[PDB]
Design a protein around this ligand. Structure first.
Ligand code: SF4
Ligand code: SF4
Length: 81
């Protein structure tokens, strides 16, 4: 799953887009919920928030290492048959 890094400049571009509504605003910058991010696997060939992002601030994150079939299985449990 992805993370948004401190360069985020709070443009909201990325929130209406995420197919699994895992992005929200909070304390200082937009935040991605680890639990709900499939890195867009089952919806887009490329992670839709990196796509909209004007700055390139969204990165894979290291304390939330997922293999592609665990991303996949998140997508199927979320959206399902
Ligand atoms: S990579 Fe996809 S699922 Fe994850 S926060 Fe971005 S738009 Fe959402
Ligand atoms: S699109 Fe990029 S700069 Fe704008 S809020 Fe989302 S992560 Fe931050």
């Amino acid at each position: 799953a992805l993370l948004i890094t401190k360069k985020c400049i709070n443009c909201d571009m990325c929130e209406p887009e995420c197919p699994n509504e895992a992005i929200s605003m909070g304390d200082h910058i937009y935040e991605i919920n680890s639990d709900k991010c499939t890195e867009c696997v089952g919806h887009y060939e490329t992670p839709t928030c990196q796509k909209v992002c004007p700055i390139p601030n969204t990165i894979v994150k290291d304390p939330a290492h997922v293999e592609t079939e665990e991303q996949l299985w998140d997508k199927f449990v979320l959206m399902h048959h």
